[PDB]
């Protein structure tokens, strides 16, 4: 299931593969939210195909309608929004992504990343190519935990090899365009943590 404007339609594996062809890279943003973050990445890189995934279609209507417009009016040819959850395991997305991100997750998705939930993270890893770079950026309250051997080993069992943990600040988050990220950036001082590496 993908969005075309405000309408949900089906995109097949063959149709997807065809679109991917005009691009050298594929990036997946899981729990993409309002689509503004992915919109900004896409407008800045026309040789990557961006796939934003979120179970809430309603919050994607604005940007989904925007990417459908003609290029002169803000349309884009390198973005698709898939309506699905981290639990969903859509077969079409298996072994497709050069990179995968989970940015500022909340609700169930946050706990899956933080706990972590090994099975769910495995579903996310299954969407990545052998190469695959990953990036999880989290915050809760407003580094030692993510650097721990236990967390490292649990991610490794899910297919994620941590190469770096970095503590980031509000200023860093100000770069993102989602309304959620802006709230996080503009509010109280908060610690943000990026756990990145390869699949």
Ligand X SMILES: Nc1ncnc2c1ncn2[C@@H]1O[C@H](CSCC[C@H](N)C(=O)O)[C@@H](O)[C@H]1O
- Rounded distance, CA 113 to CA 136, Å? 8
105 binding ligand X? (CB under 6 A): yes
CB of 64 to ligand X, least distance (A): 14
* Cα→Cα distances 60→21, 28, 124, 145, 191, Å: 25, 16, 21, 33, 27
Whole-number minimum distance, CB 32 to ligand X, in Å? 5
Q: Tell whether residue 104 is a contact of ligand X (CB under 6 A).
A: yes
Alpha-carbon gap, residue 178 to 29, rounded angstroms: 13
Confirm or reject binding of residue 35 to ligand X (CB under 6 A).
Answer: no
DSSP 43-102: HT-TTEEEEEE-S-SGGGHHHHHHHTS-GGGT--SSEEEE---TT---GGGTT-EEEEEE
Told to check if 191 binds ligand X by CB under 6 A, we report no
Nearest distance from residue 170's CB to ligand X, in Å?
14
Q: Is 93 in the site for ligand X (CB under 6 A)?
A: no
Site for ligand X contains 170 (CB under 6 A): no
- Determine how β-strand 128-138 pairs with β-strand 192-198: antiparallel
Per DSSP (E only), the strands in 144-191 are 161-168
Write down the least CB distance from residue 174 to ligand X, Å.
13
Among 83, 85, 89, 168, binds ligand X (CB under 6 A): 85
Residues 107-166 that bind ligand X (CB under 6 A): 107-109
Q: Note the residues at the interface with ligand X (CB under 6 A).
A: 30-33, 37, 54-56, 85-87, 103-109, 178, 180-181
């Amino acid at each position: 299931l993908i969005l075309k404007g405000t309408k949900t339609v089906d995109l097949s594996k063959d149709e997807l593969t065809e679109i991917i062809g005009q691009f050298d890279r594929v990036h997946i943003d899981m729990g993409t939210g309002d689509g503004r973050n992915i919109y900004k990445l896409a407008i800045n890189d026309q040789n990557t195909f961006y796939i934003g995934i979120d179970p809430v279609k309603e919050n994607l209507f604005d940007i989904s309608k925007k990417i459908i417009k003609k290029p002169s009016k803000g349309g884009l040819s390198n973005v698709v929004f898939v309506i699905a959850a981290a639990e969903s395991m859509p077969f079409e997305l298996k072994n497709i992504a050069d990179s995968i991100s989970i940015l500022f997750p909340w609700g169930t998705l946050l706990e899956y990343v933080i706990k972590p939930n090994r099975d769910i993270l495995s579903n996310v890893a299954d969407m990545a190519k052998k190469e695959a770079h990953f990036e999880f950026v989290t915050t809760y309250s407003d580094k030692a935990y993510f650097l721990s051997e236990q967390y490292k080993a649990e991610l490794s069992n899910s297919g994620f090899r941590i190469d770096d943990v970095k503590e980031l600040d509000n200023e860093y988050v100000k770069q993102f365009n989602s309304m959620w990220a802006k709230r996080l950036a503009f509010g109280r001082k908060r610690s943000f943590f990026r756990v990145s590496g390869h699949v």
